[PDB]
């Protein structure tokens, strides 16, 4: 009824939209360093 709407609204991904309205795939890299020993670190070079 009135004053009762779903909090989720759909995105309009039309191909005719502008550059700023284009669908961009965004990946977030979150880094957290605690006192625990590290398991993933920098890579190793393979020079000639």
């Amino acid at each position, epitope marked *: 009824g*009135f004053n009762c709407y779903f909090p989720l609204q759909s995105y309009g991904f039309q191909p005719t939209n502008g550059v700023g309205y284009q669908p961009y795939r965004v990946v977030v890299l979150s880094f957290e360093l605690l006192h625990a020993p590290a398991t993933v670190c920098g890579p190793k070079k393979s020079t000639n």
Partner: antibody
Amino acid sequence: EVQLVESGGGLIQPGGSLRLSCAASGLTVSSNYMHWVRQAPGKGLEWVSVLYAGGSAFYADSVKGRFTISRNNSKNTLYLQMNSLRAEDTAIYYCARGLGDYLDSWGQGTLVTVSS
Amino acid sequence: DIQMTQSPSSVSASVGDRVTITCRASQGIGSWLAWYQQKPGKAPQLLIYAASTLQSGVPPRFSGSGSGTDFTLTITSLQPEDFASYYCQQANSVLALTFGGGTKVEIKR
């Protein structure tokens, strides 16, 4: 079943501070998106500022500064404060509540005249 | 960033005519346009929203169909009561509204 009233309009100097008062009868002041649309006399409407349900607000490019929005949950009223005014600020504005990307509710308007 | 231009400004039509007001935007927007009707001396009111559906209280004479760039507010039956200005508004990602100029419909004389 909505009803919005406004008060505080009148004649004031450009070098002064003016506080508005927008009241909602069947609407809360912390649960909807509100827009302050101001329309010049003889011209079309123009966006000025927007406030969200939380503690966030936004302003346009021409009115980015000298603007403050502070809602009040005690008396269910909306307050807009204009610390600085210009000669082009005279117009008619309507406080309202709305959803995302569009607003449907509307309220009355108070005429303000600013001059020397 | 976005600017609003409306092709019609002052149009005259009879009772049995379509006003055919067109709305154009600088950048393509997909079905996020709403129309208004502000009478002189009266607070504005919404007519349609999202350019596809219709408000419950608004009579169903108003209609619109626009995909990305060209929008319209063709009316099947023009009534003497709804003689006011028309605006099409599009918002941004930060809820930045953008209202444009007024198109007025006057009775032929």
